[PDB]
């Protein structure tokens, strides 16, 4: 009757890779509605 969850053990003594890492996945979808999010469109100085 095992439990499907296990509580992580993260003591500051532990070695690299045994240590906790914070992770984020960036994901997206395309080509079905207009692009609401985009990279920064840089601008130069203006000459006249």
């Amino acid at each position: 009757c095992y439990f499907p969850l296990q509580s992580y053990g993260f003591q500051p003594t532990y070695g690299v890779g045994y240590q906790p890492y914070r992770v984020v996945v960036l994901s997206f979808e395309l080509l079905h509605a207009p692009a609401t999010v985009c990279g920064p469109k840089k601008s130069t100085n203006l000459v006249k």
Partner: protein, 47 residues
């Protein structure tokens, strides 16, 4: 193409029961990148 565009105008008037005999051009208010099909609409009134 997935944009929903609103244009509008205000004018003052003084009339009892019809749309007025004048020409006025609606300016764009806003463009909304909503991406969704529209086939029907409804309006909301103060009770």
């Amino acid at each position: 193409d997935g944009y929903f565009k609103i244009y509008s105008k205000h004018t003052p008037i003084n009339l009892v029961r019809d749309l007025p005999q004048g020409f006025s051009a609606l300016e764009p208010l806003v463009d909304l990148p909503i991406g969704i099909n529209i086939t029907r609409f409804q309006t909301l009134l103060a009770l």
